Structure 1
């Protein structure tokens, strides 16, 4: 528990959506294995009912935690002013918002907020897609190469054992892809950085990008509790970790790389900071009370990775091979000590892979996972993890791209 006299005043939760069906199932994805991909019970890209339940289990945890620390009421529904949800436009994030409220405040008549037009990107989450700002294609190449520490064309050489493992789990040698190109998974698909003319769309092509997607899909199959996960081929924790290493690397390159991170993460970073009490300007969330205690932002793994890259936070998650798992969230807390001095603390809160698979109840006695995070740039951050707000404010204002602020 926190230091003597310390009081939790305000929380900002940046959460990934819950377990979802694969966003897409391409021809390449089908061709790299002779096995058939399992059918999901929802449309591609939608949160599953189980994904919603899992999220509500996390909302239950947050309720108990925020009651303990004095921020929410014991028993009683919270006032509507106390809790606010802003979700991205997608079905998966809106339903994540809704499921959070059902767990945080069961049978309370609360509702989420989101952009009015859901058929257009919300610039808070995707400023680049929404046309707020754009990147330079050449600077993207250099930044990504800098982040990998090596030419991207050689990336697969950093991940030979992981790729080989993905190859056996797929039975890639006996796949259609290989009867159409006659076979090694790494050699067949060298890494490359591809960017469109606009510099508005960037992707890692080749084996590490493809395997990142596949590995996440296997993790989601497990979290969904599907009868067969990767066709029975993942047996050990070591194999999970080795598969998901591809996915975390892909995210580091495509979303943590600071040049990319700041173009995509600036609006959220500014919004978070402002909710925490920074004197920095930010586009207001509609209908939010000055008296708001809990701001829950329902977004994506790319958002968390963006914020991570901007603030330089890294972590690994005990029992959870995905660094940005379904329902995992960055939880920013505003604390004041007894002299009234405000600090920021940041945790990565998540469900372990076993908590997802077992749909485990999350309570103070049987909690969600949680990792206390260092902010390297905050040189006056205390050993117990508090970052003075005045320092946190400066840090943010130096990390943002001014061209990507929401005007």
Structure 2
């Protein structure tokens, strides 16, 4: 950092770690003659390896923040300094615990989360929680705007990637094709919404391939002996398959109309934690002297925040834009005249770092991409957005109806 700059605190919005598939539907089984490999935990759970991998990130964060004077160079942080808010799911709660175990091994720290884990946390899922609702016609129009073309035509944008997915699956030899054969032709894209407008999905080949491609990446990150039945051989193939996943996320999570309805609570919380002079539902029991706020959520949350702030990225060595344990790290810096700024980085394990379970240290670091905020036209060439500007950008991107009551 520049002479005189001081790191005052950090807010980390992290995806959970490596998990088993959330579901394995009959369509997912039917589109390949091969058998999907069994995971060593319940569907949707983080695996012990996933936990380990998150702890490696915690250790990296410890080294980075110690070097910047934010945490002590040895022995436990004071507990007021570090706070975890995790979503209700096993995968997110255990990610929060694994982060603490890497950040502060054998320190007696515990996470926080919503008391009732059987209901949505409106910080992560305000629409499912009933805080606000989307208008179905507006969703359809906003997704088309984001795609730049009618959604029914989306497969035509991804012919090579869909053909590769077909070959990796051996789709033409699949029970699906014995009952219903070209992967793209068989499964045209369409946007499906429930009656209330609170459940939205991209149906068809791109949506399905997005899910499958992420499962292969997860298998790889889990160190399974057979990933995609041995059918992914090259970096180009990984990139081509994950292109479908990143596109699905751009459409279904980055699209600003959707992103602000799902992301308002989190963006307000993050901004407030960085020092924006706004009203935000307080996190229970958080200290005024908090230095590190770690929020354990989902890929969709990171994508929503990216859409609200107009941030886009590609991660060297990591084909998924929202990889397991990848996090947006928001840093509040002040210069020697006491002016506050926000920097934002995407910090992540490369595909190799996941697969190899690489130790992460300052000498052998996690990946990190410094982000441009396009609306922050005063952002410095070295990446610092004046907090006063960041605050105004947040204020214009949030949906007031979706603020936590």
Cα deviation 1:79-131 (Å, max 9, x = unaligned):
00000000000000000000000000000000000000000000000000000
Cα deviation 1:320-350 (Å, max 9, x = unaligned):
0000000000000000000000000000000
The whole-number CA distance in structure 2 between the counterparts of 1:342 and 1:287 is 25
The whole-number CA distance in structure 1 between the counterparts of 2:224 and 2:178 is 29
SS of 1:86's equivalent? strand
Partner residue, 2:363: 365
Runs of 4+ in structure 1 over 2 Å off: none
Where does 1:382-401 land on structure 2 (aligned, <5 Å)? 382-401=380-399
The whole-number CA distance in structure 1 between the counterparts of 2:317 and 2:351 is 6
Q: CA deviation at 1:135?
A: 0.2
Cα deviation 1:108-163 (Å, max 9, x = unaligned):
00000000000000000000000000000000000000000000000000000000
The whole-number CA distance in structure 2 between the counterparts of 1:73 and 1:172 is 54
SS of 2:88's equivalent? coil
Q: CA deviation at 1:76?
A: 1.9
The whole-number CA distance in structure 2 between the counterparts of 1:180 and 1:137 is 33
The whole-number CA distance in structure 2 between the counterparts of 1:258 and 1:10 is 28
Cα deviation 1:281-319 (Å, max 9, x = unaligned):
100000000000000000000000000000000000000
SS of 1:119's equivalent? coil
Partner residue, 2:129: 130
Q: CA deviation at 1:165?
A: 0.1
The whole-number CA distance in structure 2 between the counterparts of 1:138 and 1:44 is 34
SS of 2:369's equivalent? strand
1:100 aligns with 2:99: yes
Q: CA deviation at 1:264?
A: 0.1
The whole-number CA distance in structure 2 between the counterparts of 1:76 and 1:205 is 50
Cα deviation 1:188-239 (Å, max 9, x = unaligned):
0000000000000000000000000000000000000001000000000000
How many residues of Structure 1 are paired with residues of Structure 2 in the alignment?
Answer: 405
SS of 1:128's equivalent? helix
Cα deviation 1:225-260 (Å, max 9, x = unaligned):
001000000000000000000000000000000000
Pairwise CA RMSD: 0.2
The whole-number CA distance in structure 1 between the counterparts of 2:37 and 2:375 is 45
TM score, norm. by length of structure 2 = 1.00
The whole-number CA distance in structure 2 between the counterparts of 1:381 and 1:319 is 27
Q: Which runs of 5+ in 1 are unaligned?
A: none
Q: CA deviation at 1:280?
A: 1.1
The whole-number CA distance in structure 1 between the counterparts of 2:157 and 2:279 is 42
Q: Which runs of 5+ in 2 are unaligned?
A: none
